[PDB]
Design a protein around this ligand. Structure first.
Ligand SMILES: CCCCCCCCCCCCCCCCCC(=O)OC[C@H](COP(=O)(O)OCCN)OC(=O)CCCCCCCCCCCCCCCCC
Ligand SMILES: NC1CCN(C[C@@H](O)COc2cccc(C(F)(F)F)c2)CC1
Lengths: 1034, 50, 50
């Protein structure tokens, strides 16, 4: 193939043009997102049963739905929570590769058949099935700076005017309203209700009767009379529209002739559907829209479109309404992608500079400057073809593959240059000879790097999905680089390079270039002499190689493991957890202290604080809250002390002094779609119907036992809420019957007054809005207020609740958990420093085995993935190693020579490990992919060295030592210049400290160390391996 | 609703097939707007209110 | 077993192995449907089947 395209440079140029056009089309049409789909597909069912405790929701909703989640394909597991707020939340997790649309449709279809079995109130509120495996692209908050609009007003305005147009913006996949539309609130007064001889049941009945849509008919409708000429539709009673209309609702007319309206026994207003959650932006009332990106959409373009739509909206807003962006991580994505692109461009420029320094030829330097961009564009085309997107993983994989790309280009051009400078042949004949020398090596290298990189695509789980991005990117880049080195680079060398004299290698030049040429010639002579001396005493260096291998193993075992570096994305979170029974006001006060601290003690770093009172993480209630702190631009936060880690540490230290509250500040995970660390998530299952109390006792026993092992298990805690006091109303139905009070009336009165009851809809400004009846807040606060509520009897006489019911205080769970349809309790923990996750999981299994009868356990979350993909690596790499050996044996036509090449892995691995250890970095994904890239480059260099040596030994009569020395002399320059180019290209990643510096350092430090030690060691260890192998096996 | 727009009550069986049952006014009593006064509703005391 | 289960005289008892593929059934068997396509009724369909 190289000879074919040397006579046909225009055909090679046509192929290159096709590749570039395909790459450009892909670049214009590729999606862009921070990360790809990593989490396994999950479908989440949400239902609300207002006014209900955890047990009521669990027994009436959660269990009924869970007993019908059958016949759904590809389900890994299922979990559910039932909260004291009246909400059930069921998550069904499916294996990776499952079609999320099909999983969702199956789940909702099974729920549609389960729907008739649920309470009528749950059916009225609706059960929603969504995809919870994704996260918010953006959060657009709406605030009022005048105080004229409360939170409900802002929420209703956003719902009516903003949600539709934002949803219609291009690329927007989903919009969730941080709030709700208006609701007709009927705040009942029990005293007035008793005065006018009424109860909440009467109010609901009247509202339902006098606010409804009635089908009337049609004038002159078919079948008509034989002479009808007019046909018109008849309109009749329609839904109410104004608070005044609801106030005029008639409940009863008294005997004396007075009229009792709804306004007489209650206040009528436009409130919110729910009041559980209060959102504030820097202390001001706020609503919001959470925008999820559509599938296949460009995140940057979608964010820009959203901002443009909001800017268009701005003029029409009511005075004092403003738009803010509390959670804007798109700037982080933009700066990260820009840094990667800049790294690629600077790498190409550095390749040009190194080529000019070493070869002092302008056209030779131009040749790689054409070759590498063609390969990159082809790689973009290949990513687009297989439905990949431009994300952090793929872009960093491209950064890593730059080393192999530049190595291929440098190898081809430098070999042609050397053939010209030694044999004195013209460019065309020299290119023919060079490619005849190196083409088989290039093909074998392509196969070997395929063997090295493909196995990562076959890892399982979220980690496997992460690794597949790098695998596909690097494999495509390597294959395209080899194809270019076989097609275009020979043609460019044959057509562009100028002739060089037989004996000219830059000695006669003057100045810095002449000095550099003389110095490099002397260094080559010295290195050749040193290698020749080394080959006389190979045993000592074999012992040294064993020492290096032992040190490599030591460093590998002593290096901690991780998944992804934690990044300073310009935002972080602060959870507030108050003691059981804390009300909304106490949590609001604590959140106010947190906001004050962030806006005063960190005013130079924090831009805004979005405090949400009503739900934290792992729960939702009046005692929980979460604040999303946004930081200023990184340019305005210089130094380590002003980054997210330092700010979070200082904030946690400051908040530790807060009393009667656990306030904890922390940073986002690398991929927010997964909450993952070097820890375990553990489920304790009630396998025999023991009950909640026995399961709590078993959990306490397990927690104590785990705490008795501080050396292996750290911070083993429950992921749930402890039992809290509850107010039990024990109704004596015998008394109710004796007093002529229907228990249905008693229960309806209690629920409507204290829990709130949804009655029906009404049309406000052309939109359906719910009508809620609830007791006015004054009369449903304390237990004594129970005495303010009366119920009519069959005799017409009111009876108080104290007359037919007693009260007391008990203990109950505010949050009931189920796993795989059985009662469960979740425990989070992490292995102690120096201990692997597997050891902690084994110890937890052992401790669980000593638990009461009928208590089982399971692993869920990341622990499930660990338990599936536990031993898959070493097998996948034993297959890779075998395939590499087979490819090398095919290439060299020898069963023993492959070992001389294969013995080079530790040379780069040791350097990568040392660089990671000194810098303190962990054994994370980026480090592992960089390690594989270093191994690939080292193997490529060793393959070329051994190929040259064996070619000299076979095609010429040169001996083993002479051939080895000549081969290393020939290969020294390309190795050194490629290593220099790649090291200088990755310097910015190593030294970076700004946005995205975590991933940059993780990628760059290992690459730097591995490349440095590989270049230093291989150049005199590969000859030793080759000589030893040929002596022992010949 | 039943008089002017028709009300579907329940199902019956015609020649072995399930079919609908509709109650509706005769055409002559639901053609003109003046026919509304021809329709009465029973009161709790038994009197027919137009 | 089938031969033995003929003196019972109380029920039809029939022991049988499964085919290689359950759905395919016996290579010489046929399944036939007599449809009531005119609303005849159950009794007339029974008479036709008889
Ligand atoms: C030229 C030829 C080049 C071929 C490629 C070289 C091989 C790959 C080099 C290693 C790269 C991956 C590094 C890595 O992440 O390894 C660690 C990972 C799990 O270990 P981890 O949880 O990180 O624990 C660290 C301890 N603190 O994984 C491991 O524990 C390492 C897995 C083994 C590495 C492959 C070499 C050994 C293969 C033989 C395994 C034998 C057992 C399996 C038998 C299967 C039989 C078919
Ligand atoms: N009825 C409404 C009342 C208002 N709030 C709004 C809060 O949910 C917004 O807070 C956020 C902000 C950003 C991200 C998230 C994430 F964690 F969900 F991703 C939550 C919800 C219920």
């Amino acid at each position: 193939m190289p000879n074919f395209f040397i006579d046909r440079p225009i055909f090679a140029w046509v192929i290159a043009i096709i590749i570039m056009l395909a790459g450009g089309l892909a670049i214009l049409k590729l999606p862009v997102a921070q990360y790809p789909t990593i989490a396994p597909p999950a479908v989440t069912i949400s239902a609300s049963y207002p006014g209900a405790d955890a047990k009521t929701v669990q027994d009436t909703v959660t269990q009924v739905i869970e007993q019908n989640m059958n016949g759904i394909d590809n389900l890994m597991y299922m979990s559910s929570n039932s909260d004291s707020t009246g909400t059930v939340q069921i998550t069904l997790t499916f294996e990776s590769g499952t079609d999320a649309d099909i999983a969702q449709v199956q789940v909702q279809n099974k729920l549609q058949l389960a729907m008739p079995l649920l309470p009528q109130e749950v059916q009225q509120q609706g059960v929603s099935v969504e995809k919870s495996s994704s996260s918010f692209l953006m959060v657009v908050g709406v605030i009022n700076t005048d105080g004229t609009m409360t939170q409900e007003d802002i929420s209703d305005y956003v719902a009516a005017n903003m949600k539709d147009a934002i949803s219609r913006t291009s690329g927007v996949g989903d919009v969730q309203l941080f709030g709700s539309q208006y609701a007709m609130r009927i705040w009942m007064n029990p005293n007035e209700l008793n005065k006018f001889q009424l109860t909440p049941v009467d109010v609901i009945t009247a509202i339902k009767a006098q606010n409804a849509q009635v089908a009337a008919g049609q004038l002159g409708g078919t079948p008509p009379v034989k002479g009808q000429q007019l046909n018109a539709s008849i309109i009749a009673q329609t839904r109410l529209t104004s608070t005044e209309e609801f106030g005029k609702i008639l409940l009863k007319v008294n005997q004396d002739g007075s009229r009792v309206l709804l306004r007489d026994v209650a206040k009528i207003e436009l409130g919110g559907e729910n009041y559980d959650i209060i959102a504030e932006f820097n202390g001001q009332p706020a609503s919001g829209l959470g925008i999820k990106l559509a599938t296949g959409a460009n995140a940057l373009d979608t964010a820009a479109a959203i901002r443009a739509e909001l800017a268009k909206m701005e003029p029409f807003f009511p005075s004092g309404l403003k738009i803010v962006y509390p959670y804007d991580t798109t700037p982080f994505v933009k700066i990260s992608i820009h840094e990667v692109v800049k790294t690629l461009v600077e790498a190409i420029i550095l390749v040009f500079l190194v080529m000019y320094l070493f070869l002092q030829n302008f056209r030779a330097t131009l040749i790689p400057t054409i070759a590498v961009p063609v390969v990159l564009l082809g790689t973009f085309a290949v990513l687009a073809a297989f439905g990949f997107s431009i994300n952090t993983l793929t872009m960093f994989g491209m950064v890593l593959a730059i080393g192999l790309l530049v190595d291929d280009a440098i190898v081809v051009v430098e070999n042609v240059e050397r053939v010209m400078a030694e044999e004195g042949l013209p460019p065309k004949e020299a290119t023919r000879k060079s490619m005849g020398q190196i083409q088989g090596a290039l093909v074998g290298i392509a196969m070997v790097l395929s063997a090295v990189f493909v196995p990562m695509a076959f890892f399982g789980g979220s980690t496997g999905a992460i690794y597949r991005q790098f695998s596909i990117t690097i494999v495509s880049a390597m294959a395209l680089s080899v194809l270019v080195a076989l097609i275009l680079t020979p043609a460019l060398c044959a057509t562009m390079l100028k002739p060089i004299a037989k004996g000219d290698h830059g000695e006669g030049k003057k100045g810095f270039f002449g000095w550099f040429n003389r110095m490099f010639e002397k260094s080559t002579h010295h290195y050749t002499d040193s290698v020749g001396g080394i080959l006389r005493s190979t045993g000592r260096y074999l012992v040294l190689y064993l020492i290096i291998v032992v040190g490599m193993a030591y460093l590998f075992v002593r290096l901690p493991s991780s998944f992804l570096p934690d990044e300073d994305q310009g935002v972080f979170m602060t959870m507030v957890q108050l003691p059981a029974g804390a009300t909304q006001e106490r949590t609001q006060k604590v959140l106010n202290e947190v906001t004050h601290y962030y806006l005063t003690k960190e005013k130079n770093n924090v831009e805004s604080v979005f405090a949400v009172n009503g739900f934290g993480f792992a729960g939702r209630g009046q005692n929980t809250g979460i604040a999303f702190v946004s930081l200023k631009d990184w340019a305005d936060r210089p130094g380590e002390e002003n980054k997210v880690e330092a700010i979070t540490m200082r904030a946690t230290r400051a908040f530790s002094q807060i009393k009667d509250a656990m306030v904890f500040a922390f940073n986002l995970p690398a991929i927010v779609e997964l909450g993952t660390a070097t820890g375990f998530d553990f489920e304790l299952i009630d396998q025999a119907g023991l009950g909640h109390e026995k399961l709590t006792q078993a959990r306490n026993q397990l927690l104590a036992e785990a705490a008795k092992h501080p050396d292996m298990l750290t911070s083993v805690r429950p992921n749930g809420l402890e039992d809290t006091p509850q107010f039990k109303i024990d109704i004596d139905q015998e008394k109710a019957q004796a007093l002529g009070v229907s228990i249905n009336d008693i229960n309806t009165t209690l629920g409507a007054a204290w829990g709130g009851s949804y009655v029906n809809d009404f049309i406000d400004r052309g939109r359906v809005k719910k009508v809620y009846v609830m007791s006015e807040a004054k009369y449903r606060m304390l237990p004594d207020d129970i005495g303010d509520w009366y119920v009519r009897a069959a005799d017409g006489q009111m009876v108080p609740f104290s007359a037919f019911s007693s009260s007391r205080w008990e203990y109950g769970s505010p949050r009931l958990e189920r796993y795989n349809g059985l009662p469960s309790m979740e425990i989070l923990g992490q292995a102690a420093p120096g201990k692997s996750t597997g050891e902690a999981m084994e110890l937890m299994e052992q401790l669980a085995s000593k638990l009461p009868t009928g208590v089982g356990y399971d692993w869920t979350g990341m622990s499930y993935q660990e338990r599936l993909s536990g031993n898959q690596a070493p097998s996948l790499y034993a297959i890779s190693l075998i395939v590499v050996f087979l490819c090398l044996a095919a290439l060299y036509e020898s069963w023993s020579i492959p070992f001389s090449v294969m013995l080079v892995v530790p040379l780069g691995v040791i350097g990568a490990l040392l660089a990671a250890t000194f810098r303190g970095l962990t054994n994370d994904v980026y480090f592992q992919v960089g390690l594989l890239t270093t191994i690939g480059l080292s193997a490529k260099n060793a393959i070329l060295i051994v190929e040259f040596a064996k070619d000299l030994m076979d095609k010429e009569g040169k001996g083993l030592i002479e051939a080895t020395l000549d081969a290393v002399r020939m290969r020294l320059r390309p190795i050194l210049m490629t290593s220099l180019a790649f090291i200088l290209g990755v310097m910015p990643l190593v030294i970076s400290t700004g946005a995205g510096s975590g991933a940059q350092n993780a990628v760059g430090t290992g690459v730097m160390g591995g490349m440095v030690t590989a270049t230093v060691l291989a150049i005199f260890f590969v000859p030793v391996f080759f000589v030893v192998v040929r002596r022992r096996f010949s």
